[PDB]
Amino acid sequence: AAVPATSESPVSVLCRESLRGQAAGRPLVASVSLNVPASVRY
Amino acid sequence: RQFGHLTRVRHVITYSLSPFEQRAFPHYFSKGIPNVLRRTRACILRVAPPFVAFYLVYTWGTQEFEKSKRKNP
Amino acid sequence: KNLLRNALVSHLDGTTPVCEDIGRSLLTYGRRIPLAEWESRIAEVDARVVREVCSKYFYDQCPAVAGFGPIEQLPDYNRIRSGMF
Amino acid sequence: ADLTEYLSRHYKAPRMVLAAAGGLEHRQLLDLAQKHFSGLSGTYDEDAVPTLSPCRFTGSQICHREDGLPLAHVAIAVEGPGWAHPDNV
Amino acid sequence: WLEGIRKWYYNAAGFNKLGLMRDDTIHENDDVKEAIRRLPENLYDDRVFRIKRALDLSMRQQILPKEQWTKYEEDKSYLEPYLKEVIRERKEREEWAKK
Amino acid sequence: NNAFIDLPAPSNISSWWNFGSLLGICLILQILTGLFLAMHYTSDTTTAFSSVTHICRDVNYGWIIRYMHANGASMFFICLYMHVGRGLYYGSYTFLETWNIGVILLLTVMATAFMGYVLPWGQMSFWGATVITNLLSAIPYIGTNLVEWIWGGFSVDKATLTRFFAFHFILPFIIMAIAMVHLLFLHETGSNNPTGISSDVDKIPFHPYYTIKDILGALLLILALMLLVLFAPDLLGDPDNYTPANPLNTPPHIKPEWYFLFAYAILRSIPNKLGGVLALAFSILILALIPLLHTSKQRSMMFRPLSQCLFWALVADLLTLTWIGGQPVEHPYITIGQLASVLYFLLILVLMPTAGTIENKLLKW
Ligand code: HEM
Ligand code: HEM
Ligand SMILES: C/C=C(C)/C=C/C=C/[C@H](OC)[C@@H](C)[C@@H](OC)[C@@H](C)CCc1oc2c(O)c(OC)cc(OC)c2c(=O)c1C
Ligand SMILES: CCCCCCO[C@@H]1O[C@H](CO)[C@@H](O)[C@H](O)[C@H]1O
Ligand SMILES: CCCCCCO[C@@H]1O[C@H](CO)[C@@H](O)[C@H](O)[C@H]1O
Ligand SMILES: CCCCCCO[C@@H]1O[C@H](CO)[C@@H](O)[C@H](O)[C@H]1O
């Protein structure tokens, strides 16, 4: 849509702080859009 | 040969200013003259001698020619 | 204009984004500009206004350029500068 | 010391905004403000008052060539108007 | 002393004034190109920057401050072990082609 | 585009690299003034000289077009010699195809200018046609036959003038096609530069950098050309060509156009027919041998002191031969010319290759 995704795709970590939150905790979800970058949560 | 396919370069940074933000003649004379003098001096020993030789051969041959065309050289 | 309207309203969705809009707006504008005001500002933009404002900031103006990576093909600044007109 | 000097000069009541959004009332927020931020300094003095000068924009270019990276990143921009300008819309 | 004219020559040649090492100035033929291709990352990247710095000085018709000139006694052939082997390999192939 | 606009070019090529575009401009200038002169020129021996005076006296601005063509030919050679000198000094000749085509270009321009000079049918026109075509008579068994065949008779005459107008008319267009091939081979490698070191790590786009530099160069070329046309149109010409051709009399102080003087001095230094012709041919064709005579481990002479000294000796020697070509065949000019002629071949065939080897030794490779 009008809003660009949090991270634009194309085709990091070195500290414990930047690593916290990286571990998965819920089932996976995949999104595809017309106007927004795709995403995969968890 | 096209930009994008010339060669491999890594870790080089280049800083530039827009031509509208800078002078076209910075220290033209203050630094230009010293540089011209330097360049002139650096080459003179390599460029000038052969031409000095030409000059000597030129003046010698011309004089020798005239002298040979008269009664008492 | 329609894209902008949608971006504005969809962004102010949830307490966090709205809280941030409050805090930052008071610092930047000195007040919270309401959606109805943004709407008025958006509604008044037309093709003429877009041409004039774009011309004012982009047209024949010197840009700042940053490149990183395999950029042998990034155009020379003079060429980039001539592309501004 | 650098950190306290910095915080001392910058963290002043007139440069801060306590903001809240959600199921709450402004009156309760304000009372909590008075209750907890009243002692917040409203004066560094007159010798400090950190004030921003305008920042000159320069048409220029910075190129960090690194053919070892797979994709190129390029960012280009002209000088924009500033927060409060109507032109931003 | 030959060696005496050598240091004299080195300075007269003047590639040191542009910050270049002797091997940065070799004429590139196929043997040389193959040798450059075989250089480890650091030697290759250093060569590239010295050549780039030299081309830049040449464009401005300038030279480096004397303290930055490549010093005769410190100039070493980083390319030699590579080029020598490339040539040896080609000679071996040429011998075989004649048999 | 990509043959011009985004053509990659070295960031450091100097003014010595401006002569290629200047040669292109000299060629266009000659073609443009040439066609306009051809609109009023007639090739019959009874009217050739007359038609040229008619151009200069009665055709509107005929005089400026004519002197621009005459002096343009001189500028063409100044640029050609500067262009070749740049190539030798910087080792540009290692681009073999480009270089050899260049040698063909030099010979074709020489042949072209020779024939044009014959067109006004003045005294120099006539004797130049006589002498130069006769170079072919040195060819054993059939030489004389070739000359009469070229002449269309037993002596230079009408048949000669008429075919020379035709040859002079078409050759420049052939030169243009050959020059385009010259550039195509060059584009395969891109340009060499003052350091003789690959410039792939620092290429800049031809436009706007060299387009503006070439324009500045073009302006300087035009200044030099117009200083000659407007202030001294006859300075580089020969008074004897203002005298109609006289088949019964060769002027006593006949001498070649200045740009042919060095070669003429070389030929004149040898008291033998075939020997002189062979030395003449070789003084030009030796350019094709330069690549095979390259001994240095480095491409350019920028970092080679000894080679530079010998290079300027060669230039000074060509200057000597040019001067000698303008002097009578008398003492001590006869001997100075013989030494200069020998020195020319000695510098190219022996001294320069030797300096190259010595320099390699001094650098320990
Ligand atoms: C009608 C005559 C000629 C024309 C129009 C012409 C044109 C050009 C042009 C446009 C260039 C590129 C610009 C430059 O580097 O100068 C060039 C390069 C070159 N030309 Fe010519 N040329 C001519 C004759 C010759 C001759 C007579 C030689 C030498 C015998 C020659 C040898 C070369 C070489 C070796 C290069 C590469 C230069 C380098 O990159 O250093 N050219 N020529
Ligand atoms: C490589 C390009 C050319 C060169 C070097 C060249 C050179 C010359 C020279 C040296 C002369 C003698 C000038 C004089 O003293 O009168 C001449 C004459 C002449 N040229 Fe060319 N020319 C060139 C191209 C052309 C072309 C394309 C034409 C015509 C289509 C042409 C037409 C003439 C005519 C008609 C004359 C006789 C009138 C005169 O002498 O000025 N030329 N040319
Ligand atoms: C149909 C076409 C034909 C036959 C073309 C032939 C082309 C031949 C060569 O060009 C490639 C040739 C022009 C070139 O030789 C390499 C020159 C440097 C030769 C220079 C040359 O000029 C002279 C000249 O101009 C004169 O004028 C009045 C008079 C001359 O002595 C009396 C001479 C002369 O003694 C020589 C050697
Ligand atoms: C040139 C600028 C266009 C004028 C837009 C003003 O717009 C007005 O701003 C008020 C203040 O927040 C709002 O209360 C009101 O609803 C809104 O329409
Ligand atoms: C073209 C002249 C080459 C002569 C060889 C140079 O020889 C060198 O000359 C220097 C300065 O005179 C001396 O300081 C040095 O000791 C000497 O070996
Ligand atoms: C560009 C500087 C050239 C030097 C000027 C002299 O020039 C010479 O003058 C002689 C008679 O005065 C002519 O016969 C000769 O062809 C001409 O080249």
Side-chain angles (χ1 to χ4, degrees), chain B residues 1-3 6-9 43 45-48 50-51 54 57-66 68-69, chain F residues 2 6 8 187-189 200-201 203-205 305 308-309 312-313 315-316 319-320 323 328 330-333 336:
Chain B
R1 314 216 70 212
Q2 163 179 41
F3 283 103
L6 300 172
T7 194
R8 183 192 174 69
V9 177
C43 75
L45 266 75
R46 300 109 178 278
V47 182
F51 289 107
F54 163 75
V57 170
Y58 170 78
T59 64
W60 179 82
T62 299
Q63 302 204 317
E64 178 58 6
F65 176 64
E66 320 269 47
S68 86
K69 294 185 84 176
Chain F
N2 243 324
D6 301 316
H187 286 187
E188 289 316 277
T189 56
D200 280 342
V201 297
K203 296 285 197 202
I204 59 181
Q308 290 181 23
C309 291
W312 292 111
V315 179
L319 176 52
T320 294
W323 159 59
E330 287 171 54
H331 159 282
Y333 303 138
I336 291 166

Side-chain angles (χ1 to χ4, degrees), chain F residues 27 30-31 34-35 37-38 41 52 66 69-70 73 76 112-113 116-117 119-120 165 168-169 172-173 175 259:
Chain F
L27 179 57
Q30 286 313 94
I31 285 170
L35 286 160
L37 289 171
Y41 173 82
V52 176
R66 191 273 170 105
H69 195 69
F76 210 142
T112 294
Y117 197 50
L119 302 188
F165 176 37
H168 181 71
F169 195 120
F173 292 100
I175 287 172
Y259 41 75

Side-chain angles (χ1 to χ4, degrees), chain C:
Chain C
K1 285 158 61 154
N2 288 333
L3 280 163
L4 189 56
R5 286 163 169 136
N6 273 273
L8 177 61
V9 308
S10 62
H11 170 70
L12 302 173
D13 180 31
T15 72
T16 308
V18 171
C19 183
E20 180 198 55
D21 186 43
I22 289 162
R24 174 166 43 58
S25 295
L26 266 283
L27 289 176
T28 61
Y29 312 120
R31 71 201 173 85
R32 180 90 192 284
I33 295 179
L35 296 187
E37 188 180 323
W38 288 117
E39 177 47 41
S40 304
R41 287 172 187 287
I42 295 171
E44 74 183 332
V45 176
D46 62 0
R48 187 198 98 258
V49 172
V50 167
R51 292 174 180 202
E52 303 188 332
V53 178
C54 282
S55 291
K56 172 177 176 183
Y57 296 91
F58 287 118
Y59 203 73
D60 195 24
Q61 294 292 340
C62 296
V65 183
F68 183 39
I71 58 172
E72 187 185 70
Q73 200 198 71
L74 170 62
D76 162 82
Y77 189 87
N78 280 304
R79 296 291 293 278
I80 287 172
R81 184 60 181 70
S82 292
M84 298 308 275
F85 65 70

Side-chain angles (χ1 to χ4, degrees), chain F residues 108-182:
Chain F
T108 308
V109 170
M110 286 181 170
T112 294
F114 151 51
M115 300 178 95
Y117 197 50
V118 178
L119 302 188
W121 210 240
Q123 277 278 62
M124 295 296 95
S125 296
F126 189 90
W127 296 110
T130 296
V131 175
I132 295 167
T133 302
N134 259 321
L135 291 169
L136 292 168
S137 71
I139 301 179
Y141 307 132
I142 66 167
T144 299
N145 304 269
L146 277 176
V147 176
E148 302 184 314
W149 178 68
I150 291 291
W151 287 344
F154 292 112
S155 58
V156 167
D157 209 328
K158 298 177 161 295
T160 313
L161 185 50
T162 300
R163 66 191 59 185
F164 272 29
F165 176 37
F167 300 154
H168 181 71
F169 195 120
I170 200 54
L171 209 36
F173 292 100
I174 287 164
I175 287 172
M176 177 178 23
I178 296 175
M180 291 181 301
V181 173
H182 181 62

